[PDB]
Amino acid sequence: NRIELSRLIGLLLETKIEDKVTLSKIAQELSKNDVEEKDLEKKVKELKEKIEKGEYEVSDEKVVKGLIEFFT
């Protein structure tokens, strides 16, 4: 991972055509961990379980957090 990622990051910095490629290769490497899947529903089914079951509140804070933590 780093083994290769390192190789590339360097390969990239030694110098864009080939770079755009080298870069394109780095990009490729950074997604391989598509496995982020986790709680593919659990986080949601939980939320709903807390949506109808009055266990989820819409505090302008949380809403503002999200909005900022994202936009900044």
Backbone angles phi, psi at 57, to 5 degrees: -110, 140
Rg of the chain, C-alpha, whole Å: 20
Q: Which helix (H) or strand (E) holds 22?
A: helix 17-31
Output the smallest distance, CB 48 to another protein, in A.
5
Contact between 58 and another protein by CB under 8 A: the answer reads yes
From the list 10, 18, 42, 55, which residue makes contact with another protein (rule: CB under 8 A)? 10
| Interface ranges with another protein (CB under 8 A) | 2, 5-6, 9-10, 13, 23-24, 26-28, 30-31, 33, 36, 44, 47-48, 51, 58, 60-72
